[model samples]
Target: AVLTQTQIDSILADLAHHTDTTEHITEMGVSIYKTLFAAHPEYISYFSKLQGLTKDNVGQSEGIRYYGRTLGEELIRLLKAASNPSVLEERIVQGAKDHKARPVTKDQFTGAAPIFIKFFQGLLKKQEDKDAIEKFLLHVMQAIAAKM
Candidate 1:
């Protein structure tokens, strides 16, 4: 599932053009997870384990802080170097390997892609270009195929 440079360019273009509002990207991420959970109920098991482990402990906020900060930094880096094939491929492979090490299933990956598709649909409520958003998400999925 190696992604080509052309595909990355298309996604970056759509993202740059359509994601003008700050809330747009934030909503995109949230909607992606919502859609993912709706599509694959079993994945909730992972979250339940996460909840139990973090219950009444510092671990809960730590996860959020780490992910939030890391994602923020990575998003900026990605946006700035969207066309860098090396960076994109490296990140994609790392994600795929990490998930695979967790024994993430192929079905989980398949189910998640459509959730991102639905996310684009939800984003369309705020922004009217459904087709473009959908295309962008597909490219994102392709870009992260290693993780899938």
Candidate 2:
């Protein structure tokens, strides 16, 4: 489901100062890679981006960080327009097509989605807020499927 304006305003107030920076993305990225790799070791090879880096350094590797920050930035930017789905939805569609051309499947985008929810959950305490946060993140996943 979509976030209502009241919810969007709350999200803006909650995530306002901290949104759109690569630092948070890197933090989320590091946790996601660490968590995902420990659970699904084979996925490490899915990213030819990491072919140059060994498992020993994938947590801090540039390849892993680049994709997360790049895509995370897109998500965060869309979050800024949470109050306006008309604007956000269109961009998400385009972003989906663009990332699809990279051949990054919808599953690839979704697989790491929860790590983001977990990260954002740590930032907000309310269950309602957390659920709304999840809805927005999943909206990113929906965007992925929209192109597929």
Candidate 3:
């Protein structure tokens, strides 16, 4: 689905509404990691800092918290920049290329998409909001994969 400016805004609003606090963002971020590692244990291998991955301490871990806070903020940037196609497109392209240079593949990306969508879906209360966010993500992934 082609995301309109309004839809992107709604997605942004939904994201903000659900992840309204640092704690919530932390929860979402760590939750995504847990799901990611659980299903694709190999993904944890992608990151070198691979220890103490238990949910009880993951949020407190430096590596995981750093990644969460940083990317969580970066996501806000994307949501805000969605109104500007050029800006958002540039970020997505750079993200794809940067990860590709690390030798990450489309298969890996696809594998990770579900956890992300589920992260949002689990936190999002509205079905339409979940649908919009999911579609927005799918479109972005498609765009990003086009480069990969």
Candidate 4:
């Protein structure tokens, strides 16, 4: 499913509609982490700060909050630059390279895609909004994984 620019714009609007404040954005990111780590406990070791925290309690970890907050911030940055393909592409490429250094494999990225899709699905209401998010995520996650 190729994402047209219109789909990206809809995804951005859906996100902006649901998350209006800094705390809301951070909470959204934290929920993603909590859900992801719970479903894929093996991935927890990827973050050194998250060591010793089991999936059951990882949501309460300060490390989780900090990383989650950063994740949210990055998403906002991505949305801000989405109008400019060159800038957005640059960010995605750099992000992929950065993750590769952390030893997150392509399969790892692919495996995590559904967790993210499901998280956003719960927040959005419209069918087009849902489809756009799913398509956008599959495209970006697959593209990011390809560079690993």
Candidate 5:
């Protein structure tokens, strides 16, 4: 899933211009989850903290927002480690391990990869950046699924 130096640099440059602030990153994360829940409403119940949330109202949940922010932070960390494949994979594995107690499947994790890739694609203008980020997102979700 690692890209060439040129590809990585392209992604880095695109990200530098787009996601410059933590708050914006958090908004992106929330949007990802919102979109996911909208398409797969049943996924909401998987989180204990998000219980009682219907697909229509889940977007307004503080807990979900917090989870979104947490995910955003993780995304930031992942991007920061993109140049180091081993470190990135290790973090993905660790995250998967942390979620082992949840009744989540590999399919569920992989299923969301496209949504993430799309969200990231919106942030990038270059084709190389889009391709690199998509590859990175797929790799991360796949690795998490494998470990989980």
Candidate 6:
């Protein structure tokens, strides 16, 4: 379930060269949640109130903003460090556990994968290396399964 070293390397490479704008990162977080919702409409109940409160508000929902900012910061630091496989694996497992603890469903995860793939593809401006991306995603899914 852990990401292969190759997949991690590719993601790190992309991060090295790709400068994600604030708006883009925000969109990525939203897209990920949207896709999750699309896959698990049942969980819509959990978000309805939060969504209603945030509707028409330019600012991000408090919970999502916190999670997104934390994730972005952690990922930036990790990518910069080019951390070892063990460290990356630990982070990956923890990330998966964090999501699974929300009681997120498997279908929701499936839905989110494409959004992540698109986000990565957009960063690269092409679909040149889907295999690596897929491997990374599988690693995430596997990690999620373990926590669930």
| Candidate 4 residue-wise lDDT at 49 | 84
Q: After the best TM-score superposition of candidate 4, give how far the Cα of residue 28 lies from its true spot, in angstroms.
A: 0.8
- List TM-score per model, in order: 0.51, 0.72, 0.77, 0.85, 0.87, 0.58
Clashing residue pairs, candidate 1?
A: 96-146, 96-147
For candidate 1, what is the TM-score?
0.51
lDDT against the true structure, per candidate, is 0.48, 0.70, 0.68, 0.76, 0.80, 0.54
Residue-level lDDT of model 6, residues 30-49, one tens digit each, is 54555545555455445424
* Model 1 C-alpha lDDT versus the unseen true structure: 0.48
Q: What residue pairs clash in candidate 5, if any at all?
A: none
lDDT of 5 by residue, 1-148 (tens): 7666677666767767435686666676788899888878998999888989898888888878778878887887777777787888778877798667787778877988888899889888887788888988898788788888
Q: After superposition, how far is residue 103 of candidate 5 from its true place, in Å?
A: 2.1
Candidates ranked by lDDT, best first?
A: 5, 4, 2, 3, 6, 1
Better of 4 and 6 by TM-score: 4
lDDT of 4 at 10: 71
Flag regions of model 5 displaced more than 4 Å.
4-9, 16-18
Of candidates 3 and 1, the better by lDDT: 3
Mark the regions of model 6 whose C-alpha exceeds 4 Å error after superposition.
1-63, 74-83
lDDT of 5: 0.80
RMSD of each: 6.3, 3.0, 2.9, 2.2, 2.0, 4.7
Candidate 5: deviation at residue 64, Å?
A: 1.7
Model 2 lDDT per residue over 2-26, tens place? 6777876776676655554668765
Top candidate (TM-score): 5
Q: Is candidate 2 or candidate 4 better by lDDT?
A: 4
> CA lDDT of 60 in candidate 3?
56
Error of 5 at 38 (Å): 0.8
For residues 1-148, write the lDDT of model 4, one tens digit per residue: 3455676667767788546787787788898998887788888888878888887788888888778877887766665656677776876886687688785678888889899888888877788878777876787678777877
